[PDB]
Amino acid sequence: VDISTLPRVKVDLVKPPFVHAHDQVAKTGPRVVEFTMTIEEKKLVIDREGTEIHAMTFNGSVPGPLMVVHENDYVELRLINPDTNTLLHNIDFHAATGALGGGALTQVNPGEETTLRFKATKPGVFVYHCAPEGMVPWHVTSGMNGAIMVLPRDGLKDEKGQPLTYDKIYYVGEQDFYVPKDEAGNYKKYETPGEAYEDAVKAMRTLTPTHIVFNGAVGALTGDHALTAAVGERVLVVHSQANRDTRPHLIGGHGDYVWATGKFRNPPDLDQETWLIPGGTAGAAFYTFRQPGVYAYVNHNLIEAFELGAAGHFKVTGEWNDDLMTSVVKPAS
Amino acid sequence: VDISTLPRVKVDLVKPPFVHAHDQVAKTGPRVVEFTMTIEEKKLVIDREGTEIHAMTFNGSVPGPLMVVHENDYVELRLINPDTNTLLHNIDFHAATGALGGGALTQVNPGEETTLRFKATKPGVFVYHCAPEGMVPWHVTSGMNGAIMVLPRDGLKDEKGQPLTYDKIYYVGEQDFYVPKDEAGNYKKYETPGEAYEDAVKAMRTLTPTHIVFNGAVGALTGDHALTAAVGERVLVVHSQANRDTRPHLIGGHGDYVWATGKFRNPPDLDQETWLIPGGTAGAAFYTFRQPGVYAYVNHNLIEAFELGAAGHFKVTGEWNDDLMTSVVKPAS
Amino acid sequence: VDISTLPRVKVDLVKPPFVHAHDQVAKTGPRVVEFTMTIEEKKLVIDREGTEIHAMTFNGSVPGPLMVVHENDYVELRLINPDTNTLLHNIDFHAATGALGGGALTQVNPGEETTLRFKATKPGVFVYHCAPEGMVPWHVTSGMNGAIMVLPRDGLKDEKGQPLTYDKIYYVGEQDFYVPKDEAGNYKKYETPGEAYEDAVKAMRTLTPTHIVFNGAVGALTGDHALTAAVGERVLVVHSQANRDTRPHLIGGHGDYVWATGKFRNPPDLDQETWLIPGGTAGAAFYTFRQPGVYAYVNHNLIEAFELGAAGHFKVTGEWNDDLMTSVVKPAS
Ligand SMILES: O=N[O-]
Ligand SMILES: O=N[O-]
Ligand SMILES: O=N[O-]
Ligand SMILES: [Cu+2]
Ligand SMILES: [Cu+2]
Ligand SMILES: [Cu+2]
């Protein structure tokens, strides 16, 4: 087909955990969906102690923004590497077919840009990440990863073929960082990326993250940046991990319908407490809130959650249901 | 509904790996099922070397006992923290909805008790664990976790909707411990829980368990405490891991029907060799024994099994089937 | 039945990643399928640095060869331990039922052989591995493992019950090695297996592989030993990991149909980006190539892939499809 005959629609991305506006059920035929991202190398403070790293980002955030299209749309990405950056970058879409997911076609030095197009032939949530030959895990584990959602044209379906429609969506990107340590255990700091590279490699080879965070930092999805919902609302939480396994859990809730490995032609798993998202994958969980209050959303390696950073909060408004749960006798001597 | 109009039934729990008597198919309407557990902080010897830790238990065991109810029963738990203990505790049920699984409503100092009720709205096996704010992974990885089984009212079903009925059930709780080590690698010992806390946190942050055990100790499910079955018997093995992934395997057998992430509205996976139970989850495997003899039941990271403790035995009685397996020529020069 | 009345067929095995000739749909009734393997202890160079270990192999390779039979065939294995070896060995088939998978019946000292027969009652891909009592993880993590495929008699089926027929098959065995290190981090070398055993145990107990490789060495499945396919070809990739989780990914492709835990009575997962194969399991992924060029096949812990060795290549011939992917604007200032 002549792609030039198709509609074009430009998306304006938003910072995670929010997601750009879209339609669950496609209201048009196939489109070329136009995205732009600008790579930004920047310093980021990732914990309460003030540890500062040299992060590598798509669009200034860890994770990069969630892109949303429908099955058999074309994704057309303008990828910009400004001359204020110092490294070579590219992009690999797990949603795409060919050329190492696009990485072989999108190598951009500082001061260059490129435009890639691919057909989104499979529905699901997928990781995208930078992948420069020879330096792949360093870029990924410096924050250079995000996700793309390819919705079925008729939206999501349950295990029986009935519609599932979310009221809200959030994107939680989980990042393992490997901050080099000296013998005594304190983090080391580096003057340039080249001077850091060997100790970055050493640190990665321990297979032991120093930090595991949501939305780029310890506590990022707490306090005034907690996730929010109301009792009765249907929420989809997209979760990605580009490099290492995770096991999400909503403390006080469930995954009512979960695609743990993220691919919508498969029936969802029902009533999950915890789900495994393998490293290199995006997954999605659908839940209808039934109680108000604070929930924690965690990686249920609780060490990873509460000691290394992989924990966020929901604040949920509405009525308490004492049939579902109540304190019969409050704590007392 | 007025819960006060429902039948009440008191359960008397038993020590793992055994399970209190119950009905697979519900013989009554919905009930309030009454449980009591008493928290016990105690010293436990966990390996053959004599390493002794300060364990934190529900009902004196690691894991805590398996609770069994049916879908849409109410679970009413009296949780007692005697004044002989020294720490604050609570309980989070992954089966429950709201208040951080019950943890926000069940904080008990030594000398206090509380009673929680929740509706068991989803069928499956689920983890429960202590979760005191700020100290969650330390309590969990000190042994303070167990599981609850919420059976469908019409019992278990295979992938075709046909009944599956077990003859025996066992509960295997798998515990990762993080015993602090000095520089030379020997375990450190501590005078009080507060003096131990920072090195406990340090030890956990390595993400490398020193011990991974079934039923609280190396070898606990061997010798006179081996699991038992007969050829032809249908056995359900419930397995939980509150904090870290595991991959159970019956050496010499299979999981004929497995709910690896534990939730019975989903069809089981058939004919598994090994299954992944993510940290924070309970799973269940159904097997019909076909050969007698010794079987090993293991986490199939074989280092975790045979060097760190995650191995137990079945002793199975009955006839040998030479059609299924035989030595044609015994080992010989 | 009198097994002596059944046809016998002798298989001549081939070195991974290739697979001996077989039929997907069984062209005969049930057979006794005869295999022979000779154990070989040998030195192997496993990385580009020249690190040499004392490997323990079935048939001289890491992994051991893929065996292929059909459901309800009998597997009859002659296992030979020549007197040029120094250790005791045996074999455990995860496909088999009884006697610890055969290990209790196949203990062979150097200079001995044995013949085991078992009925392959369950279809799927399964691990096999050595398992000498007391020394199990050392033999497995020295390379002594492979896989067996038990095909359904009517071949593979998709999620709808329609045939899936592969044009090519490859077997990727992934091996975690634990090469002991001194305090400074250099590999230690040993004079005899007994002198190595305690430091091998110490190294394993860190749960941190020094090397994670495909087909026995860093780079083994690259260059002149890259995997090959053509656009339009249907390829099945069998992947096993006898001891540790992995998460395969075809960079630039997908798993169109995946049995992540390897058992063919279950419907496959569709359109996977990445899949989790738990330690102790074999899995299988089916893909139809749609684009030519180089693909990387990796464990998508990218540190494990690109820094520790768990990466191979496909070279795919044929036409480029610009509808599926194209560079709209090549990288430029
Ligand atoms: O479910 N809470 O750790
Ligand atoms: O299956 N045994 O390690
Ligand atoms: O998908 N590549 O790392
Ligand atoms: Cu980059
Ligand atoms: Cu506690
Ligand atoms: Cu061996």
Residues A194 and A311 in one domain: yes
Question: Is the residue at B240 inside a domain?
Answer: yes
The answer to whether residues B3 and A328 touch, using CB atoms and an 8 Å cutoff, is: no
Tokens of B121: 């709205």
Q: Is C152 on the interface with B (CB under 8 A)?
A: no
CA-CA distance, B149 to B71, in Å (whole number)? 9
The answer to whether residues C28 and C178 touch, using CB atoms and an 8 Å cutoff, is: no
HSE at residue A48, side-chain half, CA atoms within 13 A, is 7
Chain C residue with minimum CA distance to A278: C276
Cis peptide before C193 (omega within 30 of 0): no
Residues B137 and B185 in one domain: no
CA-CA distance, B231 to B82, in Å (whole number)? 45
Question: Is the residue at C273 inside a domain?
Answer: yes
Residues with Cβ–ion distance below 5 A, ligand 5: B 56, 89, 130, 139, 144
Query: Atom 2, ligand 3: which residue's CA is nearest?
Result: C251
Tokens of B29: 């309407």
Residues B3 and B147 in one domain: yes
**Which of A31, A36, A35 lies closest to A74, judged by CA?**
A31
Ligand nearest to the CA of C248: 3
DSSP structural state of residue C5: G
Identify the chains in contact with A, defined as 3+ C-beta pairs within 8 A. B, C
CB contact under 8 A, A113 and C296: no
Specify which residues B148 forms β-bridges with.
Answer: B67, B126
CB contact under 8 A, A271 and B119: no
CA-CA distance, B246 to B243, in Å (whole number)? 10
Question: Is the residue at B197 inside a domain?
Answer: yes
| Cβ atoms < 10 Å from Cβ of C115 | 21
C281 lines ligand 2 (CB under 6 A): no
C150 lines ligand 2 (CB under 6 A): no
CB contact under 8 A, A98 and C324: yes
| Cβ atoms < 10 Å from Cβ of C161 | 7
End-to-end CA distance of chain B: 76
Question: Is the residue at A331 inside a domain?
Answer: no
CB contact under 8 A, A280 and C273: yes
End-to-end CA distance of chain A: 76
Residues B167 and B147 in one domain: no
Q: If 0-12 CB within 10 Å is exposed, 13-18 middle and 19+ buried, where does residue A222 land?
A: middle
- Which residues, 6+ apart, have CB-to-CB distance to C188 below 8 Å? C179, C180, C181, C182, C199
Q: If 0-12 CB within 10 Å is exposed, 13-18 middle and 19+ buried, where does residue C258 land?
A: buried
CA-CA distance, C227 to C287, in Å (whole number)? 14
Between strands C168-177 and C112-119, the pairing is unpaired
CA-CA distance, B307 to B302, in Å (whole number)? 8
| Cβ atoms < 10 Å from Cβ of C303 | 26
**Which of B300, B216, B204, B314 lies closest to B260, judged by CA?**
B300
Phi, psi of A203 (to 5 degrees): -65, -45
Between strands A234-241 and A227-230, the pairing is unpaired
What does the radius of gyration of chain B's CA atoms come to, in whole angstroms?
20
- Which residues, 6+ apart, have CB-to-CB distance to C198 below 8 Å? none
Residues C185 and C311 in one domain: yes
Residues B179 and B147 in one domain: no
CA-CA distance, C9 to C22, in Å (whole number)? 11
The answer to whether residues C92 and C102 touch, using CB atoms and an 8 Å cutoff, is: yes
Q: Which residues line ligand 1 (CB under 6 A)?
A: A 249, 251, 302; B 92, 101, 131, 136
DSSP structural state of residue C89: B
The answer to whether residues A125 and A166 touch, using CB atoms and an 8 Å cutoff, is: no
The dihedral of CA C65, C71, C76, C81: what is its sign?
positive
Instruction: Identify the active-site residue in C92, C174, C176, C304.
Output: C92
Residues A166 and A280 in one domain: yes
Query: Locate tokens 């939206």: which residue?
Result: A155
CA distance C158 to chain B (A): 15
Tokens of B247: 């991959």
Interior/surface letters B216-240, b for 16+ CB within 10 angstroms, e for the rest: bbbbbbbeeeebebebebbbbbbbb
Which of B152, B167, B189 delimits the end of a domain? B152
Rounded (5°) CA angle C254-C257-C259: 110
Which of A152, A180, A196 delimits the end of a domain? A152
| Catalytic residue status for C313 | no
* Structural domain for B313, as ranges: 153-319
How far does the centroid of ligand 6 lie from the alpha carbon of residue C140, in Å?
A: 7
CA-CA distance, C277 to C265, in Å (whole number)? 17
CA-CA distance, B93 to B131, in Å (whole number)? 10
The answer to whether residues C331 and A107 touch, using CB atoms and an 8 Å cutoff, is: yes
Specify which residues C259 forms β-bridges with.
Answer: C284
Residue in C303, C325, C328 nearest the CB of A98: C325
HSE at residue A168, side-chain half, CA atoms within 13 A, is 18
Q: Cα dist. C193→C4, C88, C145 in Å? A: 42, 12, 18
Tokens of B181: 């080590």
Number of domains in chain A: 2
How far does the centroid of ligand 3 lie from the alpha carbon of residue A95, in Å?
A: 11
- The H or E element containing residue C202 is helix C193-205
Question: Is the residue at B31 inside a domain?
Answer: yes
Residues C208 and C231 in one domain: yes
The answer to whether residues A236 and A167 touch, using CB atoms and an 8 Å cutoff, is: no
Which of B117, B152, B187 delimits the end of a domain? B152
CB contact under 8 A, B106 and A323: no
Instruction: Give the CA dihedral B203, C305, C244, B326, nearest 10 degrees.
Output: -160
The answer to whether residues C81 and C109 touch, using CB atoms and an 8 Å cutoff, is: yes
How far does the centroid of ligand 3 lie from the alpha carbon of residue B78, in Å?
A: 51
Rounded (5°) CA angle C191-C195-C196: 85
CA-CA distance, B158 to C266, in Å (whole number)? 12
Tokens of B50: 């004599």
Q: If 0-12 CB within 10 Å is exposed, 13-18 middle and 19+ buried, where does residue B1 land?
A: exposed
Query: Locate tokens 């292929």: which residue?
Result: C68
Tokens of C9: 């067929």
Question: Is the residue at C125 inside a domain?
Answer: yes
The answer to whether residues A139 and C302 touch, using CB atoms and an 8 Å cutoff, is: no
Task: Give the DSSP letter string of B123-169.
Answer: -EEEEEE---TT-HHHHHTTT-EEEEEEE-TB-EE-TTS-EE--SEE
Which residues of C fall within a CB distance of 8 Å from B270?
263, 265-266
Residues A42 and A169 in one domain: no
Residues B138 and B173 in one domain: no
CA-CA distance, C17 to B168, in Å (whole number)? 43
The answer to whether residues C8 and C78 touch, using CB atoms and an 8 Å cutoff, is: no
DSSP structural state of residue C214: E
* SS3 of chain A: CCHHHCCEEECCCCCCCCCCCCCCECCCCCCEEEEEEEEEEEEEECCCCCCEEEEEEECCECCCCEEEEECCCEEEEEEEECCCCCCCECCEECCCCCHHHHHHHCCECCCEEEEEEEECCCCEEEEEECCCCCCHHHHHCCCCEEEEEEECCECEECCCCCEECCCEEEEEEEEEECCCECCCCCECCCCCHHHHHHHHHHHHHCCCCCEEEECCCCCCCCHHHCEEEECCCEEEEEEEECCCCECEEEECCCEEEEECCCCCCCCCEEEECECCECCCEEEEEEEECCCCEEEEEEECCHHHHHCCCCEEEEEEECCCCCCCEEEEEEEEC
Residues B22 and B148 in one domain: yes
Between strands B293-299 and B311-317, the pairing is antiparallel
Which of C204, C210, C239, C276 is the best mutation test for B, with the most CBs of B within 10 A? C204
**Which of B284, B299, B96, B127 lies closest to B214, judged by CA?**
B299
Question: Is the residue at C213 inside a domain?
Answer: yes
Question: Is the residue at C326 inside a domain?
Answer: no
Cis peptide before C16 (omega within 30 of 0): no
Between strands C74-81 and C32-45, the pairing is parallel
The resolution in Å comes to 1.1
Asked if residue A139 belongs to a known ligand binding site, the reply is yes
The answer to whether residues B319 and B265 touch, using CB atoms and an 8 Å cutoff, is: no
Residues C49 and C120 in one domain: yes
